[PDB]
Design a protein around this ligand. Structure first.
Ligand SMILES: *[C@@H]1O[C@H](CO)[C@@H](O[C@@H]2O[C@H](CO)[C@@H](O)[C@H](O)[C@H]2NC(C)=O)[C@H](O)[C@H]1NC(C)=O
Ligand SMILES: *[C@@H]1O[C@H](CO)[C@@H](O[C@@H]2O[C@H](CO)[C@@H](O)[C@H](O)[C@H]2NC(C)=O)[C@H](O)[C@H]1NC(C)=O
Ligand SMILES: *[C@@H]1O[C@H](CO)[C@@H](O[C@@H]2O[C@H](CO)[C@@H](O)[C@H](O)[C@H]2NC(C)=O)[C@H](O)[C@H]1NC(C)=O
Ligand SMILES: *[C@@H]1O[C@H](CO)[C@@H](O)[C@H](O)[C@H]1NC(C)=O
Ligand SMILES: *[C@@H]1O[C@H](CO)[C@@H](O)[C@H](O)[C@H]1NC(C)=O
Ligand SMILES: *[C@@H]1O[C@H](CO)[C@@H](O)[C@H](O)[C@H]1NC(C)=O
Ligand SMILES: *[C@@H]1O[C@H](CO)[C@@H](O)[C@H](O)[C@H]1NC(C)=O
Ligand SMILES: *[C@@H]1O[C@H](CO)[C@@H](O)[C@H](O)[C@H]1NC(C)=O
Ligand SMILES: *[C@@H]1O[C@H](CO)[C@@H](O)[C@H](O)[C@H]1NC(C)=O
Ligand SMILES: *[C@@H]1O[C@H](CO)[C@@H](O)[C@H](O)[C@H]1NC(C)=O
Ligand SMILES: *[C@@H]1O[C@H](CO)[C@@H](O)[C@H](O)[C@H]1NC(C)=O
Ligand SMILES: *[C@@H]1O[C@H](CO)[C@@H](O)[C@H](O)[C@H]1NC(C)=O
Ligand SMILES: *[C@@H]1O[C@H](CO)[C@@H](O)[C@H](O)[C@H]1NC(C)=O
Ligand SMILES: *[C@@H]1O[C@H](CO)[C@@H](O)[C@H](O)[C@H]1NC(C)=O
Ligand SMILES: *[C@@H]1O[C@H](CO)[C@@H](O)[C@H](O)[C@H]1NC(C)=O
Ligand SMILES: *[C@@H]1O[C@H](CO)[C@@H](O)[C@H](O)[C@H]1NC(C)=O
Ligand SMILES: *[C@@H]1O[C@H](CO)[C@@H](O)[C@H](O)[C@H]1NC(C)=O
Ligand SMILES: *[C@@H]1O[C@H](CO)[C@@H](O)[C@H](O)[C@H]1NC(C)=O
Ligand SMILES: *[C@@H]1O[C@H](CO)[C@@H](O)[C@H](O)[C@H]1NC(C)=O
Ligand SMILES: *[C@@H]1O[C@H](CO)[C@@H](O)[C@H](O)[C@H]1NC(C)=O
Ligand SMILES: *[C@@H]1O[C@H](CO)[C@@H](O)[C@H](O)[C@H]1NC(C)=O
Ligand SMILES: *[C@@H]1O[C@H](CO)[C@@H](O)[C@H](O)[C@H]1NC(C)=O
Ligand SMILES: *[C@@H]1O[C@H](CO)[C@@H](O)[C@H](O)[C@H]1NC(C)=O
Ligand SMILES: *[C@@H]1O[C@H](CO)[C@@H](O)[C@H](O)[C@H]1NC(C)=O
Ligand SMILES: *[C@@H]1O[C@H](CO)[C@@H](O)[C@H](O)[C@H]1NC(C)=O
Ligand SMILES: *[C@@H]1O[C@H](CO)[C@@H](O)[C@H](O)[C@H]1NC(C)=O
Lengths: 118, 428, 428, 118, 428, 118
């Protein structure tokens, strides 16, 4: 169910991504709410696209993890923590990570173009 | 380790958004409202604050807008601010109704601008100001009155507030939740339950009851400038009536502009009133007192007293019963000192209503034909507080506190589906 | 076999959506309307139902909303509901115009609230009610009349209904299509043709003609409570005139509030009328009769008769000609029994118009200076039905049936681009 | 032309998918119609994305065809039937198929993540 | 070579779109306006045209809509179009104020329809028309006047026009840019600077100044039917005052309808005026003359003269100062021939204002209590032009030219992110 | 910065595509502007999708360059010209190129389906 995994560990909740994904998308209030829901959906889809993740729910990248963002190991993060706690611990680094992701995907596209010209 | 992007993460943040109506003529426009699963979050603890909940402010704006919208096509009653020549309706009454009804003569407009008509109408004394004897309506020096359309019902219809996609409403299921702080049992819904927009002061009617025990809620329980909302575990039944049989008459005041007024009374003239069982009220107060002692001291004397003053709309229990507006004197309910069969509340009827504590707008409520009786549940109280003795008095008039008593368990949150976490997976 | 997903599939389902206007002052706001390919579906058969077509309901709501919008900035004419002192305009007439025009004296308001003016106006007898002789306007006991702005034309302008992206309009090209059932020749358009919002009763004017043969359309041809819409193969020309030369006068009734009224008549006073050729009408009825025999029996006697009763708006042929509202007596057209040079219809003129069968709103149509003549095409009929003899009578008044006569060939469908089908292709 | 293939067989109509795809995307009526057109477009694109078909018109999957949905062979479906008739015969199974597609793509992404961690 | 698609290309085309407000009661609704980086384009040359700039048309529509919106809840003043019985306020004055103020007696409505009150009010002679002596207000034969709400300020507040996503605003930074043609130094912003909606004629107040030199801008400098906008390098200070101490009175004219009017004058009655330094004005004109010689000839005689005629709103310098509307006579400023300490401008005050050159709407400006003084900067001029001598005169009245003087440096462009170019890269 | 590369050469400006891409996405004016911004964004994304470029900023295709569209060499186009000048020179061929791109991607999807059936 929608947000049913909110209290579950990060690992277990990673198998319900389609459940929340499907739920992301008087007359004037309904119209304004519909328009703002569309803008939020598209903003998140644009961020996924520019990182090279346009069609994926789980997307692996080429940006290394910096231990200053979080120095926890993978068993602590995936077996003990939930996603709400994780978002709270590293919320202050969200914009740093996004910028790095943006740079890496753009660089990768350059190399792809460079290789297809040979 | 590598950065991995996850989309569809069950994470959220506090947010303020626009909510829409769902429901199953009527002043709340439930036909424009759209037609109407609770998922338990097993290990989610969520911090709530009923005093900073923007669902109350949105409900307030929505109720006022719907109220005002229902009056736009109705008769303006501009011709009614004229000098009235009034006498007492029943000079032989020696009951509490002596002087309450005025028989007022006036020159009213007609369908043709060059013709006038002489009209005799009955008015309640609370609707007129003395200038036979000369009178004017109470609204004539502050606002114009619009006649409510006789075809538009004032009966509360449950309204469900539904959130748009990308947002969710979290509900607190903790039976002892006091409106603020951590809630260990939280579930997600997209639409709240149906909340009836019941408008009243001092006594909260036809609302939700507490589960196991009475619940005292206050923004700051030690600040005497804040109101105390009391949610009862069991209802107290209140039987209200307008026992007289009122005959309604109608005249034309313009092309298609009909004026409805109180014509006569068939039979005896009697005072409107509400009946509360004495034993039920006393048990209810004993329960309120134990819960107040938990905050004010086990050895503190707890006193109840009548409202200290202000407009009739806040010094009485104001409510709409059968289309009429009742102002009941609750001094018989709040008159006790707590140290360590029927109760009858007299009620006044008014036809000129100043809603939502506004100045500049007023409504004329046309009379209801016949005898009115209604039975309601008292589900909560609004109290104010003034050593070794504490005194509590009825409060109210700000309708947001009536809606805070139903929306206290709901919070609106924004879903944040993008998460980033370290993994061993590298892009190839 | 494997599931393969196809996006862009040419599939659709019945749907009801919002349509928008396209066009090439004017009461229908064609300047807010946006500026204006038919693709044949070679093997598509589509089931149509003109009686459940939501394009008619949307067109109805749109025409009423545009009509009402054009009257918001116009003079309210509140001062006109006064006692009138009326006499006969031309006491020496012995024609059908005797008593039709009243010369009414009244005290009208001026630009200054403390000053009045005496006004003499001509009114048609159908616009006044007797209380010289005392009269009032017919609207004074039901509604206020708003003066139509003299600068706003009432001439129908074609309106194209265009569908939004994701939707399409299917058009039925079968020349014998009766409005319901399977259509073997269907094409897709996004915008219908330009449909003129012609408002009339009994006779459908300036519409579409049938191709090969006259077409009888009815929701239930055996239910006498339903109307029969008749689409003609050829038009019948109708020449309507208001032969008198009317002089229009104007007075000021407030700051910037001008009242336009019928001042005088230059020359002779004559009755308004419409001319229909007798031979053309008789051939038209013979064609209608053969098509009715196809449904009611080859040996049934088919009778035409005048409307049995009701308001003038439905017992006559109502139409707007040159800005004036004509009510023509069609009893000369529907008076025949079918077993096994000019025709002249008298017409009345009205200035107080109650549109769309509503009560509570009324319009005052200011007079048109001079002599009015218009020529229209009769493209269809609205008939009602009451053994061995069947009797048909003129009907109308519900404008949706006038629009059903143009929208009968269009259907709105939603495109469903996602399809799933088995293939031999497996994802790798 | 738009919907020109509606009367054609399923095979022939499969080569006009771009024709209908390009056509999927008073003032208040126009505004509400524009907003609803956008929501329908995005809802269909979201369904394609969650199935792993975000960039394709013809998308092959790993969900087997169940003969209880349709027991017709491929020549009957592709050479004789049109897409309108096909949608009508199997409309009752549309939601079953979509659920299976949602599960398979999510499982595939898990395996991709599992393989990139080695 | 192969076609390669690039998304995010820094390319744009000319476009017309809807702009929104950003800001940091008030007639311009800056509370509905949202809360408020300039990137230099090093090698971008952009062609501008201030005379075809749709930002001016949008600003015009927005300012008019905001102005009209601020008057919807205010008193309608319908009862004021009555006969007035007027005399001269101060029969002993021999100054320019003789006959300027009328002491007018009238019968006004009250809170009760059956009661009247006798009112004495002071009016400026420009607000009344002679029919003691009988007068009416100037608006009574053209429009109704709405009283401005005393709580709504008329003080210009800077408005920033921000463009939506997908669009950008290009700013021209060339100090000698004349409003048209190529601009070699262009930067991109998303929101313009704050432009105050200052309403004035002839003299542009509180605007932007030129950088290095005075700038003459005209759609066609040789077409005498076009206006010449002059942007000054330095401001000319103008000190305007309403030196009399006016006492404001108020009466009730209906339920909740208060009428504010000019009651009395405390002390001496003196003429309103504006002071301009003679030396500063003369230097300013010398600068304007050199720049005009650059277009009209070095040996041409340049003459300045007073406005040739028309309504007071265009023949004088019209502006709002402290809530009052001033009409200052500028004939002392434009009276010179150019071949090869204080200046005092008399001003009239008006209370009935016809804004935006419209007919049918009018506003009543309630009086301001006390003495008014304001100091403004003259930042530009609006000139018109009529051999060897050229004559220039004050112009204005079309507020778009006041806004063209601030929006001349901005252009709205649409971003076209999809580009196609040849490369050596082939898809595999 | 947004449009900072507008005056730069086509090559240099090709490395700032994410800068403009992120910037592509009273109450009634704001609502109408938001809806129209969304429609323009989605129209461009739809064109990228139908060409097989749904997730890329730089997308190479199988449509050959026709010398009648531009007979300039690559050093003239990429080292001397800016994107504004290029769009101006070949604006008249934009719709020709788009049609060819639409046909090639559709043909490629057919072949993919044809190969996965073996
Ligand atoms: C509380 O609820 C009761 C029951 O719904 C309301 O009383 C009913 O009011 C309607 C409308 O006048 C009557 O038709 C019913 O007969 C009433 N019920 C009974 C048992 O008498 C009551 O009015 C509500 N209270 C408030 C304040 O709205
Ligand atoms: C049917 O169409 C005819 C022709 O368009 C209409 O008659 C015209 O009406 C306009 C407006 O008054 C006149 O300027 C034309 O001169 C008229 N034409 C002729 C030939 O006289 C006619 O009014 C329409 N009928 C209806 C009911 O709208
Ligand atoms: C030009 O700007 C000046 C300064 O902002 C305005 O003068 C001020 O007006 C307000 C409102 O009446 C006063 O409270 C200030 O005291 C004034 N300033 C001074 C120095 O007197 C002036 O009104 C503006 N001009 C126009 C035409 O709007
Ligand atoms: C809640 O926590 C318990 C462990 O205390 C765990 O077994 C359970 O699965 C969790 N619930 C969810 C929904 O993850
Ligand atoms: C009605 O008006 C008349 C004057 O025409 C007055 O004498 C009478 O007293 C009025 N009646 C009332 C009830 O005010
Ligand atoms: C509500 O509970 C919180 C603890 O969660 C406490 O701090 C607060 O004082 C309580 N208030 C009332 C009125 O019970
Ligand atoms: C609650 O009220 C008391 C008394 O007014 C005050 O001292 C205290 O600070 C208040 N608490 C908060 C959280 O505002
Ligand atoms: C209240 O009780 C009294 C008896 O004390 C009874 O006469 C009256 O009718 C009751 N009214 C209601 C509304 O129950
Ligand atoms: C009220 O009076 C009406 C007559 O107008 C009568 O029919 C009705 O029964 C009366 N009701 C009561 C409760 O007395
Ligand atoms: C009001 O007074 C008049 C005059 O005395 C009387 O005729 C009328 O009946 C009275 N109204 C009622 C309801 O008794
Ligand atoms: C009062 O509460 C009881 C439940 O205790 C409920 O059954 C009854 O219907 C309520 N009465 C009203 C009028 O809501
Ligand atoms: C107008 O009013 C006067 C009274 O002032 C009356 O005598 C006259 O008959 C009225 N005229 C009409 C036409 O009603
Ligand atoms: C219309 O045609 C259908 C057959 O398609 C028939 O059943 C129906 O009765 C017909 N109705 C009329 C009025 O011709
Ligand atoms: C048509 O009308 C007849 C007579 O009223 C009725 O018997 C028949 O059932 C109707 N048909 C439909 C489809 O409603
Ligand atoms: C109708 O015909 C008559 C002759 O019978 C003629 O006098 C009249 O003018 C005609 N009117 C029109 C409108 O054709
Ligand atoms: C109608 O009368 C006017 C004079 O008011 C005249 O100019 C015009 O020609 C007349 N028209 C006809 C048809 O008689
Ligand atoms: C109406 O009657 C008056 C008085 O008899 C007369 O002066 C006037 O001319 C008449 N109106 C017309 C149009 O003849
Ligand atoms: C009447 O129909 C004919 C076609 O038969 C057309 O040419 C003519 O213009 C139509 N007349 C009107 C007034 O629409
Ligand atoms: C319609 O069917 C025929 C076969 O009867 C076929 O040849 C033709 O191509 C079909 N039309 C379309 C558009 O597919
Ligand atoms: C007010 O009205 C009276 C008549 O009742 C009139 O005599 C007087 O002159 C009027 N006063 C003014 C100032 O018009
Ligand atoms: C503005 O400059 C252009 C050249 O860019 C010139 O053609 C035009 O005449 C100038 N106009 C004025 C009024 O300076
Ligand atoms: C400018 O005005 C002159 C004189 O009116 C005219 O000859 C010239 O063509 C105009 N130029 C333009 C570009 O309109
Ligand atoms: C204006 O008059 C008021 C008294 O009404 C006084 O308080 C104020 O100081 C005066 N102002 C001037 C500038 O004279
Ligand atoms: C206007 O005139 C009246 C009568 O002469 C006088 O009483 C009043 O004071 C005058 N108004 C002023 C402001 O002096
Ligand atoms: C006039 O311009 C100067 C700059 O030269 C500025 O400092 C001053 O504030 C301006 N005055 C007004 C009233 O805007
Ligand atoms: C502008 O052009 C110069 C060459 O003249 C170049 O060096 C500079 O980088 C260019 N600026 C940008 C932003 O590309």
């Amino acid at each position: 169910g929608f947000l049913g995994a909110a209290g579950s560990t990060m690992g277990a909740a990673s198998m319900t991504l389609t459940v929340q994904a499907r739920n992301l998308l008087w007359g004037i209030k309904q119209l304004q709410a519909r328009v703002l829901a569309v803008e939020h959906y598209l903003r998140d889809q644009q961020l996924l696209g520019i990182w090279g993740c346009s069609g994926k729910l789980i997307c692996c990248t080429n940006v290394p993890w910096n231990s200053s963002w979080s120095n926890r190991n993978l068993s602590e993060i995936w077996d003990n923590m939930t996603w709400l706690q994780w978002d709270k611990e590293i919320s202050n680094y969200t914009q740093i990570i996004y910028g790095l992701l943006e740079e890496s995907q753009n660089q990768q596209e350059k190399n792809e173009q460079d290789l297809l010209a040979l | 380790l590598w950065v991995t992007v996850y989309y569809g993460v069950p994470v959220w943040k506090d947010a303020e958004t626009t909510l829409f109506c769902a429901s199953d003529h009527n002043v709340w426009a439930t036909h424009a409202c759209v037609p109407t699963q609770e998922i338990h979050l097993e290990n989610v603890t969520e911090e709530f604050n009923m005093w900073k909940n923007n669902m109350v402010e949105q409900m307030h704006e929505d109720i006022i807008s719907l109220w005002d919208q229902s009056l736009k096509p109705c008769v303006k009653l501009t011709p009614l601010c004229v000098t009235l020549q009034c006498t007492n309706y029943a000079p032989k009454l020696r009951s509490m109704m002596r002087g309450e009804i005025k028989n007022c003569s006036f020159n009213m407009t007609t369908e043709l601008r060059d013709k006038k008509q002489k009209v005799y109408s009955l008015f309640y004394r609370l609707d007129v100001v003395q200038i036979n004897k000369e009178y004017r309506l109470i609204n004539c020096n502050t606002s114009a009155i619009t006649q409510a359309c006789p075809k538009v019902s004032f009966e509360p219809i449950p309204i469900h507030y539904c959130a748009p996609a990308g947002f969710a409403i979290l509900k607190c299921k903790d039976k002892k939740f006091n409106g603020t702080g951590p809630c260990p049992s939280v579930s997600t819904v997209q639409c709240t339950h149906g909340i009836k927009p019941v408008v009243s002061t001092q006594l909260l009617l036809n609302g939700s009851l507490a589960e196991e025990e009475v619940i005292i809620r206050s923004e700051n329980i030690t600040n005497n400038a804040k109101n105390i909302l009391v949610q009862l575990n069991t209802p107290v039944q209140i039987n209200c009536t307008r026992p007289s049989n009122n005959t309604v008459k109608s005249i034309r005041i313009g092309p298609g502009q009909a004026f409805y007024y109180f014509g006569d009374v068939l039979g005896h003239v009697r005072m409107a009133h509400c009946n509360i069982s004495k034993a039920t009220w006393n048990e209810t107060l004993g329960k309120v007192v134990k819960q107040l002692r938990k905050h004010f001291g086990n050895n503190t004397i707890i006193r109840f007293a009548q409202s200290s003053g202000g407009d009739l709309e806040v010094t009485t229990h104001s409510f709409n019963c059968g289309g009429e507006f009742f102002y009941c004197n609750t001094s018989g309910l709040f008159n006790s000192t707590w140290i360590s069969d029927s109760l009858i509340l007299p009620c006044w009827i008014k036809q000129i209503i100043n809603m939502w504590q506004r100045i500049g707008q007023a409504m004329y409520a046309p009379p209801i034909q016949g005898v009115i009786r209604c039975v309601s549940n008292i589900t909560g109280l609004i109290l104010t507080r003034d050593s070794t003795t504490e005194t509590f008095r009825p409060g109210g008039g700000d309708m947001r506190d009536n809606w805070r008593s139903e929306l206290y368990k709901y919070k609106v949150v924004k879903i944040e589906p993008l998460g980033v976490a370290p993994t061993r997976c590298k892009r190839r």
